[PDB]
């Protein structure tokens, strides 16, 4: 399964990165009632809120994150969306390590590094989601952008596991 | 009559808590696996056993195996 393991790792790395980048980019995290200027149904992402019915349908506006030190820190963290962006950064570095591992077969730790990056990306992703949900609620529904983030988390964790398996198998085969 | 509803046993916690519990479960299992393995000093906490440890910890059913390292014990303790 060595070739297949590496194929899964590469495909999964790309899939996780693509899903998370799209999710951070697109604007269908939340379906709720508000105004992109009476308030109509809308859809919000991390940055823009946009009306999807009415006169101003298709209009978008920057969210006013900043319209209680803990509340201030939550607002700050959710405004910058540091955690989703950090998740994208780490997925990028993990993918880069997976690509590089194909070259430097002498140094095993490259692929292990990939593994760790992906696992870490997953953790930042989860923090992201909690921060996002915690900030919002402080009716509605979640769009496909939110679920892209969630699937990115799952795939990232799977790819991390597979990468660490590759490294383990290298250091086991070497002992034999 | 307010008909209970088949999955009404989930009602005490919001849907977001349940979903985050599932994600936390995966993240804990993966980190326990990672900190237990890549330590080349030792290499019983493979991924499948990690998942089983974490599941049993959440259901308060205990375990066949406990972490022995400091890292595995930190993960276990916060979970």
């Amino acid at each position: 399964d060595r070739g297949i393991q590496m194929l899964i790792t590469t495909v999964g790395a790309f899939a996780a990165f693509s899903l998370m980048t799209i999710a951070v980019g697109t604007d269908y995290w939340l379906y709720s009632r508000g105004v992109c200027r009476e308030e109509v149904m809308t859809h919000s992402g991390l940055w823009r809120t946009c009306c999807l019915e009415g006169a101003f349908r298709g209009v978008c506006k920057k969210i006013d994150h900043f319209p209680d030190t803990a509340e201030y820190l939550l607002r700050a963290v959710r405004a910058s969306s540091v955690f989703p962006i950090l998740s994208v950064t780490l997925l990028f570095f993990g993918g880069l390590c997976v690509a590089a591992s194909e070259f430097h077969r002498s140094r095993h730790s490259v692929i292990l590094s990939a593994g760790i990056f992906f696992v870490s990306a997953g953790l930042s992703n989860i923090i992201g989601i909690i921060v996002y949900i915690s900030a919002n609620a402080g009716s509605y529904s979640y769009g496909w952008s939110f679920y892209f983030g969630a699937f990115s988390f799952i795939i990232a964790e799977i790819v991390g596991v597979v990468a660490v398996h590759i490294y383990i198998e290298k250091h086991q085969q070497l002992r034999a | 009559k307010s008909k209970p509803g088949v999955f009404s046993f989930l009602d005490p916690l919001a849907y977001e808590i349940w979903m985050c519990i599932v994600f936390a479960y995966i993240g804990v299992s993966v980190v326990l696996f990672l900190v237990s393995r890549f330590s080349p000093y030792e290499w019983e906490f493979g991924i499948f056993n990690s998942l089983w440890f974490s599941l049993g910890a959440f259901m308060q059913q205990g375990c066949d195996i406990s972490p022995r390292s400091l890292s595995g014990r930190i993960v276990g303790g916060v979970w």
């Binding site: - | 900190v35 390292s69 916060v78 979970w79």
Partner: peptide, 22 residues
């Protein structure tokens, strides 16, 4: 606190690994 502890655990694992390496 949970995710904090997971981060901390990974850090301690790295430290212990490097210590046992050298």
């Amino acid at each position: 606190i949970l995710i904090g502890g997971l981060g901390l655990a990974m850090l301690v694992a790295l430290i212990e690994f490097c210590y046992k390496s050298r």
